[PDB]
Each structure stands twice: as C-alpha cells, then as structure tokens.
C-alpha cells in the first residue's frame, strides 16, 4: 500500500521529512510562537499549552550543545567558529562547528550550509571530513565532525620548505578527494589549502563546503554570480559571471593548478582582479627555479582556458600525468602509504597544529522579541541529522 | 542511550509526537502559511519553497477524503455529520464522521474531539465503536469507525413495544459498555439512547464521546460547568455546577436509571429544569403499570442522591441486582447470546435502521484568506491516527 512508500520517507536519513527533521518543524513552532505578544491568539496559545510540556521533554532527550564540553576554539570566521569538544557521555573528542542563526539571518542568505551538511554526512569517503551529528538550538546550527588533528595545508606550507616529493603526494590526495565531491554531483566553486585538513596519520581530507552546488543532468552548475576567492577563480566562471553563463567541473581543477603552483613557487600565479583573463601571457615561473619540467607541465595543464584544460575528459587524464609517476605509492594504495608529515601528537585534545584563537570571550548577540509572527527558525527546519 | 527512549515516543500510537502527529505539524504550517499576504516574509517563503513539493507528495500518499466513496448521510448535527462510506481500494464499508473545522473554530472550543478520538481508538472493547483511522484536510476532521448497521436505541424504542426481557438485556450491555469507559479513566457526563448503537448481530456498542473527561487520581472529574442534557443530569453535577464542585462515577450510573425508566415507562422521569433536585418526591411510576417490582427497584437504586446511589461501591453491586437474574444469559457470556432485535439486512450498505437525512446538498462555508498569521489548523495538530 501507500503506507509502505510513505514509510521510506520517514526512515531515509537523506529525507527532509524523516522523523528527526519532522521533529525540528514542531520544535521550530514552539521557539517561534512562545511570545507574550503572539500568545494573545487563541490558536497559538491552545497549541503551545498542548505541546510545550512534550517539546521540552524532547529537547532534553535530543542532542543539545550541553552534551559536549568545549576544550578550545580551533577555527573561526564567516558567521560561526569551530571548537575542539568532548562528548560528556562517550568521552569521544570531536570538532564542532557552531554557526550563528542571528548573523546568518541578519546578513540575509540562510541556505549555504545545506551542501556543507549533505556532503559531510553522506560522502562516505576517506577524502571528506565526516559529519556525525547535525543538531540545533534557538541560537545556532551545530556540526559535529571528526577532528583533524594534523591541522590545515595553510600552516603546513608556511612551516616547511615543501619539496616536490610532498607536492606530488598532497596534489594526488587533493585530486582523489576532489573527485569524490564530483562523484557526489557537486562542484566546489572554491578549492583552497584552508579546506585541506590532515588526519591523525597526516593524510588529507576536504572540509568547509559552503561554496558548493549540485550540477544539472547536462553536467554544469548554471550560475550568473561570482562566488569564490579572487585568486582561485577560473576565466570560465569570471567572464560569464554576470552576463549569461553556466560553469562546470573544469573550473574546479583550475584550483588544483593554483594549489600545486603555490606549493612550489611560494606565491599565487595571478595577483585589481585580472591577469587570470590573460592566463597565457601572465603565467610565469620565477627564473630560474628548481621546479621540475613535469611539475610545470601539470601546472600549465590545469591553468589554461576551459576548452582544452586537463580534467575535461575525466579524472584518469590527471591520474595518468607523469608528475604523479613515483616509485613509493600508487593511486589505489595512496592513502595506505606513510604521509610526508605525520603529526607527533601528545593528547587526544592537542591543538598544536592549529593557530591559537582565544576562547571566544564576548557578548552573544540575539534576535529581538517580535510582535508579529516572524518564523526565524523556519529555514533551519530539517537540519538535524543523527548517524543513529 | 536517550535515543532508545525518544524512539518509543516516535512509535507509540498513543503519543502526540508520533511520526503521524509530527507530519500533521508540518502539514499545518503549509496550510497556514501559503497565502500571498504572508509569503512576503522571507523566512515564510524560503520554507514554503523548500517544503511545498514534499508535503504535496505526502498529501497524496496519506489518507485523504478522496480515498472513500460517500454512500449516504446516516447521521448529522453539532458541527459535523456521519456518512456511510466505502474504501475505494479495499472495498470495506465504514461509517465516517466529517467534522467542520470552520464551525468548530468560529463557535470557539476545538478540544472536545480529543476524548472522542482516544476512546474509540484505544478502547479495545466489544462495547465501544472502533475508530480505525483518524485523518484531516484543510476543512474537516475525519473519523472512520466500524459501521453499526443495527441503528440506534432511539429508533428501537420508538418502533417496538419493548418488553422487560429486552430492557434486561439492553441495560445489561449498557452497564458493561459504560464500565469499559470507566476502566479507561473516563466519565461520559451524558449517556443517552442516541449514543447506543447496534452491531450486525443486534448487540450494543457505545459511540459519540464529545462529553467526556479524564478523572483525577482521587476518582473525580472536578468541574464547575453544566455540560449535558437537561433530563439525564444528576442532582450531584447540577447543584455544584457553578458554585464549587467535583463530579464523579456515580452521576454516570444515574443516566442508566433514566434509560431503563424510559424503556419501560415510555417517557422521562423528570420533565424549567428541576424536579431532579426533589428526585425523591417527584419520582413516580404510572399507576398502575405492568412494570415488575425488580425493574422499579433498580430504577430507584440508580435515581437517588449520590451518597447512597448504586454504583458507588463498584460495578459488581449493579451486576448482582435481581433485575438481571435470568435463565437465558450470564454477564461473562452476555455478548454471545442472541440479541432481542437482530437486523435482517439486505446489502453491506443497507441503512434501513437509520433515519433518512438527505445527501447534504449545500454550500461548504470556509475560513477567510488572512493578512496576519492565524494558525487555524494549529489545534488539529496530532489528530491523525492510523491503526497501521
Ligand atoms: C578548524 O577546523 C575546521 C574548520 C572548518 C571550517 O569550515 N572552518 C572555516 C574557517 O576556517 C569556517 C567557516 C564558517 C564558519 C566557521 C568556520 C571545518 C572543519 C574543521 C575541522 C577540524 N577538525 N575537524 C574538522
Ligand atoms: C449515525 O451513526 C453514528 C453517529 C455518531 C455520532 O456521534 N452522531 C452524532 C449525532 O447523532 C454527531 C455528533 C457530532 C457531529 C456529527 C454527528 C457516531 C457514530 C455513528 C456510527 C454508526 N455506525 N458506526 C458508527
């Protein structure tokens, strides 16, 4: 019967109307209706009276910020911050990304986090940072992810004189990790060393997918907006980013070329937002460099106009490049080899590979008590995810 | 863990936050927010866009009025009406009680149907009419119950010269059926021949429980209001029905005394709303009657002041009365004996034992399109029940 069908929708962790998402919808109404000015409506107060006891019982069973003890703030900026936390119950230590609902609403747009949530939750790849539980209170969205103790690629590049042997590895892992996102039907529209994190064994995993989009059946993310950093931007998604356009998988691979270039040159290839259009002309290596001919070959293969750019005819095109030819590892067993930098850590709460951002110390800014129905928690309905 | 606990709440058909009730909450928001005047809110439109496709897919899987083909209107009045219907799919024929959400809201109070729903759904008794599915659209509450082809006790009394043998049986079944409701922690506050329906074999079952309440741990339904018919009202819940009072189980048994009296006398015992206070003085039988001394004995046993009234010291007190002593049946096997009037029916859609109330033929009055948030479907959140 139809009850067999409607039962998949209730179970399916991917479904926006699964029991946890459904619960969010009800929890939203209590948050958005329990105001003196609004309670004057008969319908509003009858419902609030009927349900307030129940939702508050639920709120104490369901995952809440109080279940974790905040250790340090390992990251910050762009609406929220990331904290190294520990589960009070299981004693397991994770990285949790708090995201301000007030700022997210005030500064408009409250729909970027959807792909960040779906990718980390349903990637099922050793190349993507795993989201265990997504939950929320009246002030924040919460994302509990596996802690990447190794830190990010920005500080690795800044603390070492990165040899070619290392760039060969890190680029390879970025290629595999980036391919996993492509398989999932997503296009990053912004790949950076900031999003490249290292696990306990020194291996790469991608994180922070706020800049993503699901590609149409044609194989393109048809957009007429300039979303991304001004150095990792492709000439494809720059010339038609406000005058009829539809970006693709190609533009993502351009960023890998910028990454490998930065790793070996110690600066960005193009540097008040052009030279990327003239990409042929302006691309130069510091003469004379120790950079191998194959490192330069692959860099140009990526930093070229869309139509001929490497990665248009699949992933294997890249995997086959001579730059990756090495005696130490193979694509199939890459994640099983010893990484160039394996973090020598002390405790399960060691943040040495992370910049010291002080433990918050501020005033939690909040939304105001309304007179009319607002629905401020409305957009965050369906954000809760539990990996059961 | 706490997820084991919160999982019972999601399954439990009695729970107001079970998946079907949860779904209602979301379905309510779409009904109550999809208005041009309201859509102007950003939060409202983002949510409506995100969910409108899904809820409409759900609305076509979930039980809806269109799943049944209306045959006849077997009953009516007091906000709704009852129709003999057939399941288009299973071809099973039921009685469905449509209840106007507009009138229920307009004339205030939209919380009487809760006990009517819980009693019929969770009675699990051959003495109570079974509710299979409770569902709802934007205009009505729906109650699908097993059809009682035998009709009600009002027309039985009016079509026959009811002998003592019959009153012995009908009163016995009313006593058992009424005890089932008492076990469930409810007090009818209005028992009538209108609520007494007969199954296909001519046996009694109680229906229409709008006038109910759940009794406190003391064993009383502490009320200071006069809810009930002016002839079946007890002196206990009349003298203290607007001047400090707390009614009980006793007042329900008074109505059984009125019923047995009506069955044998052909009129009501008290008949511009007194004589019930003077219950001793005014109680008289039409001299001289053919009514047996035991029939009169039991009638007085019920129609007396609370403090001494039969039924105060349990059900067995009543079951033990000599009026019930008979050679034909016993309390334990009463429902297994041949009933006084077994309906000789033609088809599975025969309504001969029901008054002919024309097939509606009118204008469906509706709520108005609002400018501000109303929440008209708010009270009906949690009404949906499926006996899976
Ligand atoms: C610092 O660690 C992280 C940071 C991020 C991340 O997305 N950070 C950026 C800023 O860099 C951000 C954006 C928006 C709001 C807040 C923060 C994602 C995962 C981790 C992490 C570390 N271990 N496991 C997971
Ligand atoms: C006529 O049949 C019924 C009537 C009722 C019932 O409650 N009727 C009253 C009016 O009499 C009413 C009150 C409020 C709104 C509408 C109707 C309840 C069950 C049946 C029935 C018949 N077979 N199975 C179930």
PDB file of C-alpha atoms in Angstrom, chain B residues 71-281:
ATOM      1  CA  UNK B  71     -22.909   6.326   0.022  1.00  0.00           C
ATOM      2  CA  UNK B  72     -25.447   8.074   2.345  1.00  0.00           C
ATOM      3  CA  UNK B  73     -25.531  10.505   5.302  1.00  0.00           C
ATOM      4  CA  UNK B  74     -26.561   8.212   8.200  1.00  0.00           C
ATOM      5  CA  UNK B  75     -26.333  10.966  10.868  1.00  0.00           C
ATOM      6  CA  UNK B  76     -25.844  14.731  11.368  1.00  0.00           C
ATOM      7  CA  UNK B  77     -25.776  17.807  13.672  1.00  0.00           C
ATOM      8  CA  UNK B  78     -23.464  19.519  16.235  1.00  0.00           C
ATOM      9  CA  UNK B  79     -20.599  20.720  13.940  1.00  0.00           C
ATOM     10  CA  UNK B  80     -20.438  17.680  11.671  1.00  0.00           C
ATOM     11  CA  UNK B  81     -22.299  14.697  10.151  1.00  0.00           C
ATOM     12  CA  UNK B  82     -21.806  10.916   9.743  1.00  0.00           C
ATOM     13  CA  UNK B  83     -21.722   9.204   6.355  1.00  0.00           C
ATOM     14  CA  UNK B  84     -21.843   5.560   5.360  1.00  0.00           C
ATOM     15  CA  UNK B  85     -18.750   5.307   3.075  1.00  0.00           C
ATOM     16  CA  UNK B  86     -16.749   2.644   1.173  1.00  0.00           C
ATOM     17  CA  UNK B  87     -12.968   2.342   0.820  1.00  0.00           C
ATOM     18  CA  UNK B  88     -12.245   2.713  -2.919  1.00  0.00           C
ATOM     19  CA  UNK B  89      -9.201   0.463  -2.510  1.00  0.00           C
ATOM     20  CA  UNK B  90     -10.137  -2.409  -0.037  1.00  0.00           C
ATOM     21  CA  UNK B  91     -13.919  -2.204  -0.799  1.00  0.00           C
ATOM     22  CA  UNK B  92     -14.552  -2.335   3.029  1.00  0.00           C
ATOM     23  CA  UNK B  93     -17.602  -0.263   4.123  1.00  0.00           C
ATOM     24  CA  UNK B  94     -17.379   2.012   7.217  1.00  0.00           C
ATOM     25  CA  UNK B  95     -19.166   4.939   8.937  1.00  0.00           C
ATOM     26  CA  UNK B  96     -17.162   8.185   8.709  1.00  0.00           C
ATOM     27  CA  UNK B  97     -17.764  11.257  10.886  1.00  0.00           C
ATOM     28  CA  UNK B  98     -16.906  14.512   8.988  1.00  0.00           C
ATOM     29  CA  UNK B  99     -16.377  17.472  11.450  1.00  0.00           C
ATOM     30  CA  UNK B 100     -16.358  21.154  10.252  1.00  0.00           C
ATOM     31  CA  UNK B 101     -13.068  22.924  11.227  1.00  0.00           C
ATOM     32  CA  UNK B 102     -14.631  26.285  10.256  1.00  0.00           C
ATOM     33  CA  UNK B 103     -17.692  25.956  12.592  1.00  0.00           C
ATOM     34  CA  UNK B 104     -15.566  24.311  15.298  1.00  0.00           C
ATOM     35  CA  UNK B 105     -13.273  27.375  15.297  1.00  0.00           C
ATOM     36  CA  UNK B 106     -15.918  30.099  14.668  1.00  0.00           C
ATOM     37  CA  UNK B 107     -18.142  28.957  17.565  1.00  0.00           C
ATOM     38  CA  UNK B 108     -14.944  28.782  19.789  1.00  0.00           C
ATOM     39  CA  UNK B 109     -13.875  25.390  21.610  1.00  0.00           C
ATOM     40  CA  UNK B 110     -11.863  22.940  19.421  1.00  0.00           C
ATOM     41  CA  UNK B 111     -10.836  20.345  22.037  1.00  0.00           C
ATOM     42  CA  UNK B 112     -13.927  18.145  22.632  1.00  0.00           C
ATOM     43  CA  UNK B 113     -12.986  15.602  19.962  1.00  0.00           C
ATOM     44  CA  UNK B 114      -9.795  14.517  21.762  1.00  0.00           C
ATOM     45  CA  UNK B 115     -11.555  12.069  24.134  1.00  0.00           C
ATOM     46  CA  UNK B 116     -13.898  11.018  21.292  1.00  0.00           C
ATOM     47  CA  UNK B 117     -10.719  10.082  19.313  1.00  0.00           C
ATOM     48  CA  UNK B 118      -8.790   8.410  22.202  1.00  0.00           C
ATOM     49  CA  UNK B 119     -11.750   6.359  23.449  1.00  0.00           C
ATOM     50  CA  UNK B 120     -12.719   4.974  20.054  1.00  0.00           C
ATOM     51  CA  UNK B 121      -9.085   4.360  19.087  1.00  0.00           C
ATOM     52  CA  UNK B 122      -7.761   2.816  22.287  1.00  0.00           C
ATOM     53  CA  UNK B 123     -10.823   1.267  23.942  1.00  0.00           C
ATOM     54  CA  UNK B 124     -10.134  -2.256  22.669  1.00  0.00           C
ATOM     55  CA  UNK B 125     -13.605  -3.340  23.843  1.00  0.00           C
ATOM     56  CA  UNK B 126     -16.525  -5.001  22.098  1.00  0.00           C
ATOM     57  CA  UNK B 127     -18.686  -2.414  23.907  1.00  0.00           C
ATOM     58  CA  UNK B 128     -17.173   0.680  22.207  1.00  0.00           C
ATOM     59  CA  UNK B 129     -17.355   1.668  18.486  1.00  0.00           C
ATOM     60  CA  UNK B 130     -13.862   1.208  16.961  1.00  0.00           C
ATOM     61  CA  UNK B 131     -12.012   4.085  15.258  1.00  0.00           C
ATOM     62  CA  UNK B 132      -9.745   2.671  12.572  1.00  0.00           C
ATOM     63  CA  UNK B 133      -8.277   5.864  11.122  1.00  0.00           C
ATOM     64  CA  UNK B 134      -8.436   9.489  12.114  1.00  0.00           C
ATOM     65  CA  UNK B 135      -7.259  11.903   9.390  1.00  0.00           C
ATOM     66  CA  UNK B 136      -7.831  15.533   8.224  1.00  0.00           C
ATOM     67  CA  UNK B 137      -7.783  18.022   5.372  1.00  0.00           C
ATOM     68  CA  UNK B 138      -7.835  21.881   5.470  1.00  0.00           C
ATOM     69  CA  UNK B 139     -11.623  21.889   6.071  1.00  0.00           C
ATOM     70  CA  UNK B 140     -12.547  18.839   8.240  1.00  0.00           C
ATOM     71  CA  UNK B 141     -11.545  16.295  10.928  1.00  0.00           C
ATOM     72  CA  UNK B 142     -12.335  12.696   9.903  1.00  0.00           C
ATOM     73  CA  UNK B 143     -13.224   9.670  11.912  1.00  0.00           C
ATOM     74  CA  UNK B 144     -13.518   6.317  10.216  1.00  0.00           C
ATOM     75  CA  UNK B 145     -15.448   3.905  12.507  1.00  0.00           C
ATOM     76  CA  UNK B 146     -16.936   0.424  12.095  1.00  0.00           C
ATOM     77  CA  UNK B 147     -20.479   0.712  10.758  1.00  0.00           C
ATOM     78  CA  UNK B 148     -23.249  -0.167  13.232  1.00  0.00           C
ATOM     79  CA  UNK B 149     -25.913  -1.416  10.852  1.00  0.00           C
ATOM     80  CA  UNK B 150     -28.490  -2.097  13.581  1.00  0.00           C
ATOM     81  CA  UNK B 151     -29.141   1.611  14.130  1.00  0.00           C
ATOM     82  CA  UNK B 152     -29.582   3.366  17.486  1.00  0.00           C
ATOM     83  CA  UNK B 153     -31.700   2.739  20.603  1.00  0.00           C
ATOM     84  CA  UNK B 154     -33.832   5.870  19.938  1.00  0.00           C
ATOM     85  CA  UNK B 155     -35.486   4.360  16.922  1.00  0.00           C
ATOM     86  CA  UNK B 156     -35.646   0.847  18.555  1.00  0.00           C
ATOM     87  CA  UNK B 157     -37.643   2.288  21.464  1.00  0.00           C
ATOM     88  CA  UNK B 158     -39.882   4.147  19.025  1.00  0.00           C
ATOM     89  CA  UNK B 159     -40.562   1.174  16.712  1.00  0.00           C
ATOM     90  CA  UNK B 160     -41.348  -1.504  19.328  1.00  0.00           C
ATOM     91  CA  UNK B 161     -43.377  -2.168  22.488  1.00  0.00           C
ATOM     92  CA  UNK B 162     -40.197  -3.024  24.455  1.00  0.00           C
ATOM     93  CA  UNK B 163     -40.766  -5.902  26.891  1.00  0.00           C
ATOM     94  CA  UNK B 164     -38.932  -6.382  30.183  1.00  0.00           C
ATOM     95  CA  UNK B 165     -36.898  -9.246  28.653  1.00  0.00           C
ATOM     96  CA  UNK B 166     -35.382  -6.633  26.264  1.00  0.00           C
ATOM     97  CA  UNK B 167     -34.760  -3.916  28.857  1.00  0.00           C
ATOM     98  CA  UNK B 168     -32.970  -6.596  30.983  1.00  0.00           C
ATOM     99  CA  UNK B 169     -30.556  -7.205  28.029  1.00  0.00           C
ATOM    100  CA  UNK B 170     -30.059  -3.596  26.751  1.00  0.00           C
ATOM    101  CA  UNK B 171     -29.476  -2.306  30.324  1.00  0.00           C
ATOM    102  CA  UNK B 172     -27.012  -5.150  30.971  1.00  0.00           C
ATOM    103  CA  UNK B 173     -24.999  -4.285  27.786  1.00  0.00           C
ATOM    104  CA  UNK B 174     -25.139  -0.549  28.677  1.00  0.00           C
ATOM    105  CA  UNK B 175     -23.766  -1.448  32.137  1.00  0.00           C
ATOM    106  CA  UNK B 176     -20.862  -3.421  30.575  1.00  0.00           C
ATOM    107  CA  UNK B 177     -20.158  -0.827  27.867  1.00  0.00           C
ATOM    108  CA  UNK B 178     -20.301   2.008  30.399  1.00  0.00           C
ATOM    109  CA  UNK B 179     -17.942   0.122  32.721  1.00  0.00           C
ATOM    110  CA  UNK B 180     -15.384  -0.159  29.871  1.00  0.00           C
ATOM    111  CA  UNK B 181     -15.296   3.674  29.663  1.00  0.00           C
ATOM    112  CA  UNK B 182     -14.888   3.903  33.446  1.00  0.00           C
ATOM    113  CA  UNK B 183     -11.921   1.480  33.265  1.00  0.00           C
ATOM    114  CA  UNK B 184     -10.371   3.827  30.682  1.00  0.00           C
ATOM    115  CA  UNK B 185     -10.484   6.616  33.309  1.00  0.00           C
ATOM    116  CA  UNK B 186     -13.328   8.479  31.576  1.00  0.00           C
ATOM    117  CA  UNK B 187     -16.687   9.770  32.778  1.00  0.00           C
ATOM    118  CA  UNK B 188     -19.333  10.243  29.965  1.00  0.00           C
ATOM    119  CA  UNK B 189     -21.152  13.161  31.715  1.00  0.00           C
ATOM    120  CA  UNK B 190     -24.084  12.359  29.274  1.00  0.00           C
ATOM    121  CA  UNK B 191     -25.203   8.740  28.459  1.00  0.00           C
ATOM    122  CA  UNK B 192     -28.183   8.528  26.021  1.00  0.00           C
ATOM    123  CA  UNK B 193     -30.079   6.112  23.729  1.00  0.00           C
ATOM    124  CA  UNK B 194     -28.637   8.281  20.879  1.00  0.00           C
ATOM    125  CA  UNK B 195     -25.113   7.007  21.827  1.00  0.00           C
ATOM    126  CA  UNK B 196     -26.306   3.382  21.940  1.00  0.00           C
ATOM    127  CA  UNK B 197     -25.749   1.636  18.602  1.00  0.00           C
ATOM    128  CA  UNK B 198     -26.300  -1.908  17.473  1.00  0.00           C
ATOM    129  CA  UNK B 199     -23.843  -4.076  15.574  1.00  0.00           C
ATOM    130  CA  UNK B 200     -24.748  -6.525  12.696  1.00  0.00           C
ATOM    131  CA  UNK B 201     -25.865  -9.162  15.264  1.00  0.00           C
ATOM    132  CA  UNK B 202     -28.054  -6.690  17.259  1.00  0.00           C
ATOM    133  CA  UNK B 203     -25.595  -6.160  20.127  1.00  0.00           C
ATOM    134  CA  UNK B 204     -24.847  -2.832  21.786  1.00  0.00           C
ATOM    135  CA  UNK B 205     -21.779  -0.591  21.440  1.00  0.00           C
ATOM    136  CA  UNK B 206     -21.326   2.991  22.713  1.00  0.00           C
ATOM    137  CA  UNK B 207     -20.435   5.897  20.387  1.00  0.00           C
ATOM    138  CA  UNK B 208     -20.086   9.829  20.356  1.00  0.00           C
ATOM    139  CA  UNK B 209     -17.904  10.714  23.325  1.00  0.00           C
ATOM    140  CA  UNK B 210     -17.686  14.503  22.952  1.00  0.00           C
ATOM    141  CA  UNK B 211     -18.992  14.989  26.538  1.00  0.00           C
ATOM    142  CA  UNK B 212     -16.102  13.044  28.283  1.00  0.00           C
ATOM    143  CA  UNK B 213     -13.234  13.914  30.744  1.00  0.00           C
ATOM    144  CA  UNK B 214     -10.301  12.045  32.364  1.00  0.00           C
ATOM    145  CA  UNK B 215     -10.854  11.609  36.147  1.00  0.00           C
ATOM    146  CA  UNK B 216      -8.147  12.760  38.670  1.00  0.00           C
ATOM    147  CA  UNK B 217      -6.179  10.224  40.856  1.00  0.00           C
ATOM    148  CA  UNK B 218      -8.856  10.807  43.600  1.00  0.00           C
ATOM    149  CA  UNK B 219     -11.569   9.425  41.247  1.00  0.00           C
ATOM    150  CA  UNK B 220     -13.467  12.570  40.231  1.00  0.00           C
ATOM    151  CA  UNK B 221     -13.826  14.930  37.231  1.00  0.00           C
ATOM    152  CA  UNK B 222     -13.652  18.259  39.207  1.00  0.00           C
ATOM    153  CA  UNK B 223     -15.861  20.563  37.111  1.00  0.00           C
ATOM    154  CA  UNK B 224     -17.854  23.765  37.802  1.00  0.00           C
ATOM    155  CA  UNK B 225     -19.844  23.751  34.467  1.00  0.00           C
ATOM    156  CA  UNK B 226     -23.248  22.247  33.416  1.00  0.00           C
ATOM    157  CA  UNK B 227     -22.306  20.000  30.417  1.00  0.00           C
ATOM    158  CA  UNK B 228     -25.097  17.545  29.484  1.00  0.00           C
ATOM    159  CA  UNK B 229     -28.780  17.091  28.535  1.00  0.00           C
ATOM    160  CA  UNK B 230     -31.396  18.595  30.948  1.00  0.00           C
ATOM    161  CA  UNK B 231     -33.157  15.228  31.604  1.00  0.00           C
ATOM    162  CA  UNK B 232     -30.137  12.906  32.061  1.00  0.00           C
ATOM    163  CA  UNK B 233     -28.495  15.381  34.553  1.00  0.00           C
ATOM    164  CA  UNK B 234     -27.687  14.112  38.103  1.00  0.00           C
ATOM    165  CA  UNK B 235     -28.534  16.283  41.203  1.00  0.00           C
ATOM    166  CA  UNK B 236     -24.800  15.888  42.158  1.00  0.00           C
ATOM    167  CA  UNK B 237     -23.500  17.670  38.978  1.00  0.00           C
ATOM    168  CA  UNK B 238     -26.399  20.205  38.966  1.00  0.00           C
ATOM    169  CA  UNK B 239     -26.293  21.726  42.499  1.00  0.00           C
ATOM    170  CA  UNK B 240     -22.497  22.286  42.285  1.00  0.00           C
ATOM    171  CA  UNK B 241     -22.243  23.241  38.541  1.00  0.00           C
ATOM    172  CA  UNK B 242     -21.370  26.915  39.139  1.00  0.00           C
ATOM    173  CA  UNK B 243     -20.546  27.111  42.855  1.00  0.00           C
ATOM    174  CA  UNK B 244     -17.569  24.870  43.853  1.00  0.00           C
ATOM    175  CA  UNK B 245     -17.873  21.190  42.829  1.00  0.00           C
ATOM    176  CA  UNK B 246     -16.191  17.962  41.626  1.00  0.00           C
ATOM    177  CA  UNK B 247     -18.466  15.337  39.832  1.00  0.00           C
ATOM    178  CA  UNK B 248     -17.752  11.534  39.793  1.00  0.00           C
ATOM    179  CA  UNK B 249     -18.506   7.972  38.513  1.00  0.00           C
ATOM    180  CA  UNK B 250     -21.893   7.978  40.378  1.00  0.00           C
ATOM    181  CA  UNK B 251     -23.505  10.626  38.056  1.00  0.00           C
ATOM    182  CA  UNK B 252     -22.940   8.349  35.040  1.00  0.00           C
ATOM    183  CA  UNK B 253     -24.958   5.497  36.561  1.00  0.00           C
ATOM    184  CA  UNK B 254     -27.897   7.914  37.125  1.00  0.00           C
ATOM    185  CA  UNK B 255     -28.308   8.003  33.330  1.00  0.00           C
ATOM    186  CA  UNK B 256     -28.677   4.217  33.174  1.00  0.00           C
ATOM    187  CA  UNK B 257     -31.611   4.601  35.589  1.00  0.00           C
ATOM    188  CA  UNK B 258     -33.125   7.208  33.261  1.00  0.00           C
ATOM    189  CA  UNK B 259     -32.622   4.869  30.300  1.00  0.00           C
ATOM    190  CA  UNK B 260     -34.261   1.816  31.973  1.00  0.00           C
ATOM    191  CA  UNK B 261     -37.079   4.100  33.201  1.00  0.00           C
ATOM    192  CA  UNK B 262     -37.687   5.444  29.623  1.00  0.00           C
ATOM    193  CA  UNK B 263     -37.602   1.920  28.196  1.00  0.00           C
ATOM    194  CA  UNK B 264     -40.409   0.717  30.488  1.00  0.00           C
ATOM    195  CA  UNK B 265     -42.412   3.909  31.096  1.00  0.00           C
ATOM    196  CA  UNK B 266     -42.322   5.465  27.590  1.00  0.00           C
ATOM    197  CA  UNK B 267     -41.289   8.838  28.962  1.00  0.00           C
ATOM    198  CA  UNK B 268     -38.633  10.609  31.005  1.00  0.00           C
ATOM    199  CA  UNK B 269     -38.745  10.562  34.845  1.00  0.00           C
ATOM    200  CA  UNK B 270     -38.303  14.327  35.326  1.00  0.00           C
ATOM    201  CA  UNK B 271     -39.708  16.912  32.881  1.00  0.00           C
ATOM    202  CA  UNK B 272     -37.947  24.687  33.713  1.00  0.00           C
ATOM    203  CA  UNK B 273     -35.141  22.222  34.645  1.00  0.00           C
ATOM    204  CA  UNK B 274     -35.882  21.000  38.211  1.00  0.00           C
ATOM    205  CA  UNK B 275     -37.791  18.064  39.808  1.00  0.00           C
ATOM    206  CA  UNK B 276     -34.332  16.333  39.613  1.00  0.00           C
ATOM    207  CA  UNK B 277     -33.365  18.195  42.869  1.00  0.00           C
ATOM    208  CA  UNK B 278     -36.579  16.817  44.507  1.00  0.00           C
ATOM    209  CA  UNK B 279     -35.799  13.348  42.884  1.00  0.00           C
ATOM    210  CA  UNK B 280     -37.344  11.516  45.945  1.00  0.00           C
ATOM    211  CA  UNK B 281     -40.691  13.391  45.973  1.00  0.00           C
TER     212      UNK B 281
END
